[PDB]
Amino acid sequence: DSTECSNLLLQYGSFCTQLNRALTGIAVEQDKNTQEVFAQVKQIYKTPP
Amino acid sequence: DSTECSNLLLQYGSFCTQLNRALTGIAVEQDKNTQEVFAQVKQIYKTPPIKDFGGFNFSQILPDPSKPSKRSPIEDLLFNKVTNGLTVLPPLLTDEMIAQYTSALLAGTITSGWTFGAGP
Amino acid sequence: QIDRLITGRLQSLQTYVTQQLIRAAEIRASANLAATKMSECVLGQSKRVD
Amino acid sequence: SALGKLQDVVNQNAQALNTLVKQLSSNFGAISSVLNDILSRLDPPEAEVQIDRLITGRLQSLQTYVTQQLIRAAEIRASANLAATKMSECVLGQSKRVD
Amino acid sequence: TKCTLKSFTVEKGIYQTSNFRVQPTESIVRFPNITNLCPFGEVFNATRFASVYAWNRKRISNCVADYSVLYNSASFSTFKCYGVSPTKLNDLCFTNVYADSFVIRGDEVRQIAPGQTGKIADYNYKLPDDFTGCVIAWNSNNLDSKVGGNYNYRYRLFRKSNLKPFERDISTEIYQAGSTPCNGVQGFNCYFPLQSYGFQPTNGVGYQPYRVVVLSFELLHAPATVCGPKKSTNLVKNKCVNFNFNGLTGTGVLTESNKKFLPFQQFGRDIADTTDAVRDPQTLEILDITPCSFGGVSVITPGTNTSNQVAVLYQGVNCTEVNVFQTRAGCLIGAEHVNNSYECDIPIGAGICASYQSIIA
Amino acid sequence: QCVNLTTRTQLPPAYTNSFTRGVYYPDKVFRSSVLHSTQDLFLPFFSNVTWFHAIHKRFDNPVLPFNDGVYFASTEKSNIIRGWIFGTTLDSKTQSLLIVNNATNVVIKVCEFQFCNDPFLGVYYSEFRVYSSANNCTFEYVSQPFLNFKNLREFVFKNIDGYFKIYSKHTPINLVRDLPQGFSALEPLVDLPIGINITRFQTLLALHRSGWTAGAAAYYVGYLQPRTFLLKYNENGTITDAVDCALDPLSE
Numbered sequence: 001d002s003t004e005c006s007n008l009l010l011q012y013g014s015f016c017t018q019l020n021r022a023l024t025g026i027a028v029e030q031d032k033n034t035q036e037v038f039a040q041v042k043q044i045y046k047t048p049p
Numbered sequence: 050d051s052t053e054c055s056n057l058l059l060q061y062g063s064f065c066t067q068l069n070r071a072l073t074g075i076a077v078e079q080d081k082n083t084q085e086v087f088a089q090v091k092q093i094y095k096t097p098p099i100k101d102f103g104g105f106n107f108s109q110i111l112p113d114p115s116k117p118s119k120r121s122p123i124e125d126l127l128f129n130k131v132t133n134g135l136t137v138l139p140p141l142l143t144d145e146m147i148a149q150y151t152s153a154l155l156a157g158t159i160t161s162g163w164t165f166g167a168g169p
Numbered sequence: 170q171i172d173r174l175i176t177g178r179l180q181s182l183q184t185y186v187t188q189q190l191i192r193a194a195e196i197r198a199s200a201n202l203a204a205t206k207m208s209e210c211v212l213g214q215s216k217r218v219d
Numbered sequence: 220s221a222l223g224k225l226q227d228v229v230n231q232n233a234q235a236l237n238t239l240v241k242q243l244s245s246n247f248g249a250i251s252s253v254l255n256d257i258l259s260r261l262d263p264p265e266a267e268v269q270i271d272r273l274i275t276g277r278l279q280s281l282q283t284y285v286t287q288q289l290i291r292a293a294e295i296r297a298s299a300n301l302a303a304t305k306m307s308e309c310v311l312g313q314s315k316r317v318d
Numbered sequence: 319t320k321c322t323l324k325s326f327t328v329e330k331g332i333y334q335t336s337n338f339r340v341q342p343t344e345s346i347v348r349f350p351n352i353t354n355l356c357p358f359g360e361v362f363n364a365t366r367f368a369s370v371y372a373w374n375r376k377r378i379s380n381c382v383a384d385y386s387v388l389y390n391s392a393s394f395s396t397f398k399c400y401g402v403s404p405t406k407l408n409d410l411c412f413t414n415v416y417a418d419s420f421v422i423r424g425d426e427v428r429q430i431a432p433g434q435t436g437k438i439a440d441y442n443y444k445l446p447d448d449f450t451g452c453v454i455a456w457n458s459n460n461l462d463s464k465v466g467g468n469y470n471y472r473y474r475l476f477r478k479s480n481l482k483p484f485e486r487d488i489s490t491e492i493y494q495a496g497s498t499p500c501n502g503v504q505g506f507n508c509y510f511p512l513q514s515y516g517f518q519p520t521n522g523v524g525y526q527p528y529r530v531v532v533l534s535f536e537l538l539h540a541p542a543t544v545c546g547p548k549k550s551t552n553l554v555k556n557k558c559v560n561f562n563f564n565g566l567t568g569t570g571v572l573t574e575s576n577k578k579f580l581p582f583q584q585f586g587r588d589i590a591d592t593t594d595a596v597r598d599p600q601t602l603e604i605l606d607i608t609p610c611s612f613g614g615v616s617v618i619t620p621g622t623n624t625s626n627q628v629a630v631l632y633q634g635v636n637c638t639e640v641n642v643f644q645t646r647a648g649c650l651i652g653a654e655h656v657n658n659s660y661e662c663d664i665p666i667g668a669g670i671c672a673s674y675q676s677i678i679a
Numbered sequence: 680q681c682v683n684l685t686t687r688t689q690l691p692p693a694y695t696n697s698f699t700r701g702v703y704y705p706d707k708v709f710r711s712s713v714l715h716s717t718q719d720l721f722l723p724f725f726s727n728v729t730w731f732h733a734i735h736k737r738f739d740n741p742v743l744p745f746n747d748g749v750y751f752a753s754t755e756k757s758n759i760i761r762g763w764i765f766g767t768t769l770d771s772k773t774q775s776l777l778i779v780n781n782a783t784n785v786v787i788k789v790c791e792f793q794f795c796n797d798p799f800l801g802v803y804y805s806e807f808r809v810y811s812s813a814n815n816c817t818f819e820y821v822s823q824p825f826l827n828f829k830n831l832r833e834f835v836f837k838n839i840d841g842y843f844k845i846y847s848k849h850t851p852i853n854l855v856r857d858l859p860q861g862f863s864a865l866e867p868l869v870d871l872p873i874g875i876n877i878t879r880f881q882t883l884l885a886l887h888r889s890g891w892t893a894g895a896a897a898y899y900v901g902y903l904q905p906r907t908f909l910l911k912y913n914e915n916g917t918i919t920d921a922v923d924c925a926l927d928p929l930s931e
């Protein structure tokens with residue numbers, strides 16, 4: 001919550017944006033991986049009783 | 050163009066050489082990738098002038114003679130639908146030669162099936 | 170002093186994000202392999218040895 | 220959005236180039252982001268310090284750009300190896316592999 | 319190539335050795351056509367200055383300013399400049415100049431600086447921390463001293479709060495240093511805010527009258543008015559020249575531009591945040607600054623076991639700015655172009671390859 | 680000479696929507712085909728802009744704050760609005776700014792005017808009663824004339840670092856009563872090196888005489904706040920659209 005720290009951090013530019021974008025890419029990549037692995041059928045089949 | 054800046058930059062050593070070497074490796078890797086994907090045949094096959102394939106129509110995937118780019122209508126649509134010390138090196142294979150490679154692959158798989166991939 | 174703390178924490182965060190990207194590439198390769206096994210071993214019978 | 224994968228690669232490369240060019244506009248704590256202004260305004264004892272700050276900022280930016288370029292090169296190499304495998308097995312023959 | 323690869327034997331292939339960039343030929347300085355000199359004489363050689371609590375600010379614009387007249391003259395004890403070099407001031411252009419003149423004592427001359435404290439800095443004259451300019455202080459014993467005391471120069475001694483930078487305070491209200499109200503009468507714990515220097519010519523060098531002029535230059539985004547005595551040269555186009563347009567320095571090729579500038583606009587800029595267009599100060603002409611031809615030099619060679627012949631490729635450089643053959647990849651020197659097609663031996667790019675049979679492309 | 684106007688009708692000032700007006704060029708740099716993000720003193724989109732009338736008996740010359748900056752809109756026909764007054768105390772104690780546009784030219788003067796309680800101009804169907812004195816004058820600037828409701832005048836007045844920036848735009852409209860909904864980027868008109876403290880401002884109107892009659896006019900006062908806009912520059916260097924970064928989550 002330090003405002004002076006954020007004011008000094010603004011001198012370094014858009015590093016925080018790059019880190020957030022990389023983490024967002026990893027986060028959507030995990031969901032894409034699960035979607036490719038498990039969601040290979042569009043019909044939900046059931047066994048007979 | 051600052052000489053003083055380059056003199057101060059020389060204190061850090063061969064970082065610039067390392068970055069140029071990495072970018073050169075990436076640049077040759079792209080050409081290697083294009084060679085591996087498209088240049089799998091050493092014969093440039095051509096379709097016969099008469100398109101008698103027993104009712105099968107390949108006009109949308111074969112190259113159009115009327116177009117100067119010698120691309121297929123599908124390939125033409127694909128090309129239409131895709132839109133301070135930095136330099137862009139041109140690729141080793143141009144777009145017309147890549148289209149020629151795809152045309153050779155299409156002619157081989159239409160006229161010869163899978164036989165051209167295993168030999169004559 | 171805050172500038173020293175900022176550059177140290179920024180270097181740590183960049184290191185963490187870089188190693189997370191490397192692990193993400195490794196997990197993506199493993200997941201592509203798992204999807205290939207899902208398609209070829211579960212949804213069909215595979216002639217590929219081992 | 221049929222051709223999203225190629226447009227995604229083109230947009231990522233263009234965005235990386237735009238970010239690398241944009242990083243020249245940052246002064247990184249110096250008085251100015253323009254080297255000519257510093258060289259025309261200041262004596263070499265303090266212009267050396269300002270140029271040193273600009274050099275370390277731009278070098279960090281360039282190393283970062285090369286790092287993501289290498290990661291994207293590895294990803295594109297994996298995709299190209301997959302494409303070569305599909306060209307060999309689906310086009311040049313008939314594949315028994317499901318999907 | 320042998321020096322670059324750190325080996326005495328070079329294998330067959332293409333190798334990036336160095337980079338090529340065309341040198342600038344001429345230097346073109348374009349300043350506005352002004353001749354009238356702005357009164358540095360009325361700032362510096364005035365008969366009577368003002369006190370530091372009521373420091374005199376003069377606005378300077380639309381002139382040629384010869385700063386080396388002030389620099390090289392052996393009359394100023396202190397000519398100390400912040401944010402700019404004093405020798406380089408002839409080669410710069412500023413939008414406005416503020417000349418702030420006052421009279422202080424010698425020991426207070428140090429207090430005219432950013433990030434300093436004292437009576438003058440807190441209560442009389444405050445400089446901002448981003449100050450760009452010069453502080454010019456010289457002794458004034460014969461002018462500002464008199465036997466029996468010169469009490470006409472006063473400094474503000476008492477104020478409730480410190481001064482903001484470049485804030486002028488001329489109020490005369492009795493300072494309340496206690497709990498009792500003053501009601502405009504000096505007395506116990508109620509003082510006049512202004513205190514006299516009381517200069518005498520027999521005083522020490524610390525208590526000695528120094529006249530101080532502070533020049534502050536507005537380097538902000540605005541049309542430039544104050545410019546140095548550098549003479550304008552004629553405009554040359556379609557070549558690589560160093561240029562100094564109204565104090566904006568660069569290297570490039572100045573050409574005609576179809577960009578319709580609005581009349582208030584001087585510079586132009588793109589998505590890359592680079593000055594690619596400027597307005598001529600004299601002809602009011604908008605000039606496109608295309609940066610000059612550059613690229614990498616690649617040495618195409620076979621193995622040193624085979625031959626020592628080499629060819630050079632200038633990437634992305636046309637052949638007229640450097641066995642000459644123009645390719646899309648760049649200009650190729652030393653390799654003959656043939657009409658026959660062979661398999662690729664050494665890759666050049668854009669469908670072009672090189673081989674040895676002499677070196678053919 | 681001063682004249683009290685004692686035939687006014689009491690009415691509270693109105694309020695209306697700013698829509699997407701008040702955007703000006705933030706700097707003197709040409710930009711083409713680009714999207715530029717800038718943080719400056721801007722008028723917020725869809726803000727509450729105060730509406731004042733001149734109709735007959737309405738004559739709105741109140742005392743308004745200046746604050747950080749002032750956006751001034753004018754739905755004008757037949758040239759009633761003539762100028763503005765800027766200052767802090769509006770008397771001879773402090774130094775005040777006069778901007779007038781009479782039948783010939785535009786005059787800017789920085790003097791210690793002893794202003795009247797009701798400063799006004801007059802047209803006879805030859806009357807000027809704004810100040811009673813002007814003793815210490817530092818800045819003078821004579822320039823060209825700047826100027827159903829037929830004309831729309833937008834001005835932006837800012838005072839930063841001793842510089843008074845006036846931005847202007849002239850728009851042909853045919854809307855009867857309110858602000859038209861649209862976008863028009865305000866070009867900078869003049870930069871004045873006045874270097875004075877401004878906290879209060881006054882609008883100057885013109886009377887019509889054969890008492891007095893007020894011609895049909897309406898003006899709008901909005902206040903600038905420090906915020907970020909995303910401006911779009913076309914191929915001709917003209918700002919054609921803008922986004923308020925802090926208005927709503929879509930524009931954010």
Ligand SMILES: *[C@@H]1O[C@H](CO)[C@@H](O[C@@H]2O[C@H](CO)[C@@H](O)[C@H](O)[C@H]2NC(C)=O)[C@H](O)[C@H]1NC(C)=O
Pocket residue numbers: 100106107108
């Ligand atoms: C194969 O398909 C193409 C395209 O669908 C056919 O070309 C069309 O032919 C009809 C009649 O001659 C024309 O009216 C269309 O304008 C043609 N379309 C195009 C895109 O050329 C073609 O006739 C089909 N058959 C053969 C043997 O090529």
Ligand SMILES: *[C@@H]1O[C@H](CO)[C@@H](O[C@@H]2O[C@H](CO)[C@@H](O)[C@H](O)[C@H]2NC(C)=O)[C@H](O)[C@H]1NC(C)=O
Pocket residue numbers: 681682683796797
């Ligand atoms: C117009 O009206 C204003 C206010 O109604 C008058 O200002 C006042 O004038 C009286 C008489 O000189 C003073 O005692 C007050 O102090 C004034 N008020 C303020 C707030 O200063 C003004 O004089 C009138 N104009 C004329 C020409 O009579």
Ligand SMILES: *[C@@H]1O[C@H](CO)[C@@H](O)[C@H](O)[C@H]1NC(C)=O
Pocket residue numbers: 358359362363
């Ligand atoms: C002031 O006058 C002296 C006269 O001897 C002259 O040499 C000097 O240059 C003058 N200073 C300025 C700033 O004109």
Ligand SMILES: *[C@@H]1O[C@H](CO)[C@@H](O)[C@H](O)[C@H]1NC(C)=O
Pocket residue numbers: 351599600601602
């Ligand atoms: C001086 O500059 C003006 C531009 O303000 C130009 O119109 C005029 O031709 C110039 N005169 C000379 C002699 O260069």
Ligand SMILES: *[C@@H]1O[C@H](CO)[C@@H](O)[C@H](O)[C@H]1NC(C)=O
Pocket residue numbers: 694695696726727
């Ligand atoms: C504008 O303000 C007035 C009172 O200050 C209020 O009654 C009115 O609803 C406001 N309008 C809008 C659109 O916020």
Ligand SMILES: *[C@@H]1O[C@H](CO)[C@@H](O)[C@H](O)[C@H]1NC(C)=O
Pocket residue numbers: 485767768876877878
């Ligand atoms: C400007 O005027 C206001 C009121 O008139 C005052 O409170 C403020 O301190 C003044 N600012 C300066 C810098 O004089």
Ligand SMILES: *[C@@H]1O[C@H](CO)[C@@H](O)[C@H](O)[C@H]1NC(C)=O
Pocket residue numbers: 781782783784786
């Ligand atoms: C307009 O004002 C200027 C200066 O105030 C004056 O010289 C000029 O004569 C005026 N014109 C008219 C028509 O009043």
Ligand SMILES: *[C@@H]1O[C@H](CO)[C@@H](O)[C@H](O)[C@H]1NC(C)=O
Pocket residue numbers: 814815
């Ligand atoms: C302002 O005017 C008054 C009266 O005309 C005068 O006494 C005073 O000295 C003037 N102030 C300045 C700074 O000239």
Ligand SMILES: *[C@@H]1O[C@H](CO)[C@@H](O)[C@H](O)[C@H]1NC(C)=O
Pocket residue numbers: 913914915
């Ligand atoms: C830009 O200007 C040209 C005139 O050269 C005009 O044809 C075009 O319509 C303009 N563009 C826009 C978006 O108004």
